[PDB]
């Protein structure tokens, strides 16, 4: 079921040897050659001008950083990743996340979509794309940073029973309307809306609403 | 006063989400008089600039991985060593900690990080692995972020940048690409070229060179040569470098014999030569203002430093002030004239003692305010004066006119002809005491004013000696009353001449205050003049750049951008 390592050499070494100019394959070999073979848990493929990563992940990692290359799309990741690091690429859309996956890091691409996101979520960064609406929001996800991004609504989606929660970013959008669903979240939130075009009625209707006994309310900055 | 950096610290450190100056890094800045050369080496991750750093100040034969034990997770590092082959100057090393979420992420706010070498910078280094590209320009996105991150004047924009950006230095990482016909500059220059068009593709893709074009006036590049070892992780050797270094410290060595003879000092608007103190409110207000949501401008970082310095300037006035009266004034003053003369002419030091040390003082409002405590000062000098000048002709009172206060006590003139012997002995008396040197102001009203104390003895002396005709014969009571009226006559007709006098002296010190200021502010604007004509000189070196090669789409819109300067440089 699993690959084996004679496996994964040959299909590497043809993937070498579809090397375009300047693309440095022959680096990212012999790290993959060093990452199986020690069954190390991280894969560091950072700045080396990839354009198309191989099929064939050793499915054993579980941190991956293959951030500031020209990836378009990205191929189906190891079960057993916990961290992943790609940032600045040229992605337009995501493969499935592995369901044990915690960090996304996957900031300066071209997403518009986004698939199911796991509830092992405890942080992730998903500034400068170009998205509009978003999936389910896992429980335990406290972290968002959705400031570069051309999204219109926050549904935030519930889970069971979501305990204290962390700092959302929304900044520089076009939200322009807050759900009462951020209102009903208590007094131990953080969401920061700054720069984006609100309903007239509702750049007030906030304003008064938070200079009172607003004891049971989220803090919102704009 | 020599500093010499052992080890560079972190200046300001990225944690948690916000930036939080190093204080320790501030204390040792505050203790540099000398002025300062600033060249930042900014970079991403691992981008070999290390080799660089630890190369510009010269530690040893190269340094062996700097200090790796201590990797804070921040933002910028300093190192500041005397500077080689400029004096006076103190040679300052900025570096990032590596950008690009390599074991922390919160690379969120580095956009900042890069705006802010720049304005903390007099020579930029950028360091990229070679072959200038499409993933580099993109990579250089900071420049992108420059246009909205800072500002040149403040409001109650991206123009005004070239004036005060440093030069563009472009160190490629591993490069040294034999590609023949070209030179490094013809490189860098080849690479800046634009790509005529209208689609949406060409203006993202010469965005970001027409930014390091307009934005920085000097550019010049520089390579790397990078060891044969290809695997070789930070080997600590230097005679396996001499072995893996044939050109390439010819290289390196060369480019810090370029820093070291073409980096300018540091300036501000003025010819501010920035120091340590100075370098430190810069850093402080520029973080400040980041940290408290607002966009950080260098207009408002150098009024913030000319508020600490133009304080400090008045109290150095203030204190010279001090010092010239304290060995000039010989209290009791002989005249007034004497003591104004004496207080305008170390007033107009106090006055030139703040004018250099003084720069943009808005509304003048501490020249003004150096005026008001010289005026305090101008007070209590003459009230000094009179209780030094009447705390002497007292005294002299109690030792010319005691005599004769017993001889009257001991009933001496009433007898025959007393009235007579009394009166020619005070005619004596009075004279001595006019004739004693040094006497001051307040001689005419002390003497007087004891007179008029004394004439109920004067008046019992009479009715006393008969010796001739009296009791309706007392001509000499009412010509007593004569001399007491003409001399309360001009003692008042000379407190109209002192209170003129001060009325005249408030009116040539306000004179000599628009004076020095005068020179000051036409000194202000030769220079803002000439600080415009070079940053015009630019703006025109890179118009005809635009129309030479090719593109005259954007020298129009360049022309737009200099005739809108053409009416600010006009009121
Ligand atoms: N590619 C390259 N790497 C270098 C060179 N010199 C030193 N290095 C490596 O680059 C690392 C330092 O990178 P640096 O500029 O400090 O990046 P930072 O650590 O993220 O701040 C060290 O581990 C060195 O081993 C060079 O000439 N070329």
């Known amino acids: ?222 | 006063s020599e500093i010499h950096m052992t080890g560079p610290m972190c200046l300001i450190e990225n944690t948690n989400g916000r930036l939080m100056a190093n204080p320790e890094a501030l204390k040792i800045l505050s203790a540099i008089t000398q002025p300062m050369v600033v060249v930042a080496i900014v970079g991403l991750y691992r981008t070999g600039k290390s080799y660089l750093m630890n190369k510009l100040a010269g530690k040893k034969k190269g340094f062996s991985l700097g200090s790796t034990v201590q990797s804070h997770t921040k933002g910028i590092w300093m190192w500041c060593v005397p500077h080689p082959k400029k004096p006076g100057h103190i040679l300052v090393l900025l570096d990032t900690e590596g950008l690009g979420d390599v074991e922390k992420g919160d690379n969120q706010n580095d956009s900042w990080i890069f705006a802010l070498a720049v304005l903390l910078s007099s020579t930029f280094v950028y360091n990229s692995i070679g072959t200038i590209n499409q993933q580099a320009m993109d990579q250089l996105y900071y420049v992108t972020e420059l246009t909205h991150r800072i500002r040149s004047k403040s409001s109650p924009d991206s123009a005004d940048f070239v004036s005060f950006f440093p030069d563009f230095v472009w160190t490629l990482r591993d490069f040294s690409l034999d590609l023949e016909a070209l030179t490094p500059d013809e490189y860098l220059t080849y690479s800046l070229k634009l790509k005529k068009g209208t689609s949406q593709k060409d203006e993202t893709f010469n965005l970001p060179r027409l930014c390091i074009r307009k934005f920085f006036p000097k550019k010049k590049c520089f390579v790397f040569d990078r060891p044969v070892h290809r695997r070789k992780l930070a080997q600590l050797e230097k005679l396996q470098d001499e072995e893996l270094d044939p050109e390439f410290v010819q290289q390196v060595a060369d480019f810090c014999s370029y820093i070291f003879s073409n980096s300018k000092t540091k300036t501000l608007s003025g010819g501010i030569q920035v120091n340590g103190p100075r370098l430190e409110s810069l850093v402080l207000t520029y973080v400040n203002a980041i940290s408290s949501g607002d966009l950080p401008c260098m207009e408002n970082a150098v009024l913030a430093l000319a508020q600490i310095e133009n304080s400090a300037a008045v109290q150095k006035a203030i204190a010279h002030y001090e010092q010239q009266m304290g060995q000039k004034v010989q209290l009791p003053t002989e005249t007034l004239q004497e003591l104004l003369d004496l207080h305008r002419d170390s007033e107009r030091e106090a006055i030139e003692v703040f004018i250099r040390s003084s720069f943009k003082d808005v509304d003048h409002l501490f020249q003004k305010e150096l005026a008001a405590q010289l005026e305090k000062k101008r007070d209590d000098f003459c009230k000094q004066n009179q209780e030094a000048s009447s705390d002497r002709c007292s005294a002299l009172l109690q030792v010319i006119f005691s005599p004769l206060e017993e001889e009257v006590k001991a009933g001496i003139y009433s007898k025959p002809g007393g009235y007579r012997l009394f009166v020619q002995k005070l005619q004596d008396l009075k004279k001595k005491y006019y004739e004693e040197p040094r006497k001051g102001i307040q001689a005419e009203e002390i003497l007087q004013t004891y007179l008029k104390s004394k004439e109920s003895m004067t008046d019992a002396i009479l009715q006393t000696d008969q010796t001739l005709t009296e009791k309706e014969k007392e001509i000499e009571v009412e010509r007593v009353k004569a001399e007491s009226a003409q001399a309360s006559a001009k003692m008042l007709h000379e407190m109209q001449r002192k209170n003129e006098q001060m009325m005249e002296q408030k009116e040539r010190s306000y004179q000599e205050h628009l004076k020095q200021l005068t020179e000051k502010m036409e000194n202000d604007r030769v220079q803002l003049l000439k600080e415009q004509e070079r940053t015009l000189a630019l703006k025109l070196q890179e118009q005809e750049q635009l129309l030479k090669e090719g593109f005259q789409k954007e020298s129009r819109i360049m022309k737009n951008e200099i005739q809108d300067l053409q009416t600010k440089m006009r009121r």
Request: hydrophobic residues 35%; charged residues 20%.
């Open chain 1, 1 to 222: 079921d699993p690959s084996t390592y004679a496996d994964y050499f040959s299909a590497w070494d043809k993937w070498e040897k579809q090397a375009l100019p300047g693309e440095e394959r022959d680096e990212a070999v012999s790290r993959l050659k060093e990452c199986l073979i020690n069954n190390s848990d991280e894969l560091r493929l950072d700045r080396l001008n990839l354009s198309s990563l191989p099929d064939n992940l050793p499915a054993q990692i579980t941190l991956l950083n293959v951030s500031y290359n020209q990836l378009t799309n990205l191929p189906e990741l190891p079960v057993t990743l916990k961290k992943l690091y790609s940032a600045s690429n040229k992605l337009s859309e995501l493969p499935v996340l592995p369901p044990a996956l915690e960090s996304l890091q996957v900031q300066h691409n071209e997403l518009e979509n986004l698939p199911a996101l796991p509830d092992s979520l405890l942080t992730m960064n998903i500034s400068y794309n170009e998205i509009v609406s978003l999936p389910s929001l896992p429980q335990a996800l406290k972290n968002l940073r959705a400031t570069r991004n051309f999204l219109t609504e926050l549904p935030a989606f519930s889970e069971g029973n979501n305990p204290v929660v962390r700092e959302y970013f929304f900044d520089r959008n076009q939200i322009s309307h807050i759900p009462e669903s951020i209102l009903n979240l208590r007094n131990e939130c953080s969401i920061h809306i700054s720069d984006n075009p609100l309903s007239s009625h509702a750049l007030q209707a906030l304003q008064r609403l938070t200079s009172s006994p607003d004891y049971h309310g989220p803090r919102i900055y704009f």
